[PDB]
Scaffold this active site. Structure first.
Site, PDB file in Angstrom:
ATOM      1  N   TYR A  26      77.376 -19.937  30.285  1.00  0.00           N
ATOM      2  CA  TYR A  26      77.773 -20.880  31.318  1.00  0.00           C
ATOM      3  C   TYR A  26      78.970 -20.343  32.095  1.00  0.00           C
ATOM      4  CZ  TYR A  26      81.751 -22.795  28.570  1.00  0.00           C
ATOM      5  OH  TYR A  26      82.907 -22.958  27.847  1.00  0.00           O
ATOM      6  N   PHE A  36      86.780 -23.322  36.086  1.00  0.00           N
ATOM      7  CA  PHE A  36      87.625 -23.944  35.071  1.00  0.00           C
ATOM      8  C   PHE A  36      87.276 -23.541  33.650  1.00  0.00           C
ATOM      9  CE2 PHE A  36      84.606 -27.076  33.473  1.00  0.00           C
ATOM     10  CZ  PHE A  36      83.705 -27.155  34.518  1.00  0.00           C
ATOM     11  N   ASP A  37      86.040 -23.134  33.369  1.00  0.00           N
ATOM     12  CA  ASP A  37      85.637 -22.781  32.018  1.00  0.00           C
ATOM     13  C   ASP A  37      84.441 -21.848  32.117  1.00  0.00           C
ATOM     14  OD1 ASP A  37      85.481 -22.616  29.290  1.00  0.00           O
ATOM     15  OD2 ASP A  37      84.905 -24.703  28.956  1.00  0.00           O
ATOM     16  N   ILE A  56      78.850 -32.235  27.165  1.00  0.00           N
ATOM     17  CA  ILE A  56      78.819 -33.422  28.008  1.00  0.00           C
ATOM     18  C   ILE A  56      77.386 -33.692  28.441  1.00  0.00           C
ATOM     19  CG2 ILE A  56      81.193 -33.200  28.780  1.00  0.00           C
ATOM     20  CD1 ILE A  56      80.006 -31.846  31.346  1.00  0.00           C
ATOM     21  N   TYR A  82      84.098 -36.887  32.845  1.00  0.00           N
ATOM     22  CA  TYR A  82      85.526 -37.174  32.963  1.00  0.00           C
ATOM     23  C   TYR A  82      85.882 -37.935  34.238  1.00  0.00           C
ATOM     24  CZ  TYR A  82      86.194 -33.839  29.130  1.00  0.00           C
ATOM     25  OH  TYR A  82      86.135 -33.179  27.925  1.00  0.00           O
ATOM     26  N   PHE A  99      78.148 -25.823  37.593  1.00  0.00           N
ATOM     27  CA  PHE A  99      77.961 -24.906  36.477  1.00  0.00           C
ATOM     28  C   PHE A  99      76.909 -23.863  36.816  1.00  0.00           C
ATOM     29  CE2 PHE A  99      79.660 -28.650  34.394  1.00  0.00           C
ATOM     30  CZ  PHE A  99      80.556 -28.107  33.503  1.00  0.00           C
TER      31      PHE A  99
END
Length: 107
Positions: A26, A36-37, A56, A82, A99
């Site tokens: 991912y 962010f990730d 999530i 979130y 993503f």
């Protein structure tokens, strides 16, 4: 709400089932924002299983709608991860997350 835009190559049939530890390269992104990730940055391709709600709901529902080899593109709604809470320092409240999900899995 999961909007899947699969970049075509894959196999089209190896769907993640319940309890299947599956592997995703991912790469996160914010709508009108940066990353962010990323499992690609860690080079640790996030061996996660289906059916525990570890991930999530925007990332969980995108997994079973893909197959092996496929390269989809999540546009995750805020209210599943979130939207009202927001993560401190990573995810603001009411964010529509993006993503780069490529299901190259196991099991």
């Amino acid at each position: 709400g999961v909007e899947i835009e699969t970049i075509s190559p894959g196999d089209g049939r190896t769907f993640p089932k319940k309890g299947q530890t599956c592997v995703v390269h991912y790469t996160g992104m914010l709508q009108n924002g940066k990353k962010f990730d990323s499992s690609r940055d860690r080079n640790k391709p996030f061996k996660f299983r289906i059916g525990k709600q570890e991930v999530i709901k925007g990332f969980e529902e995108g997994a079973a709608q893909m197959s092996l080899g496929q390269r989809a593109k999540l546009t995750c709604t805020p209210d599943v991860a979130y939207g009202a809470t927001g993560h401190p320092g990573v995810i603001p409240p009411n964010a529509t997350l993006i993503f780069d999900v490529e299901l190259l899995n196991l099991e």
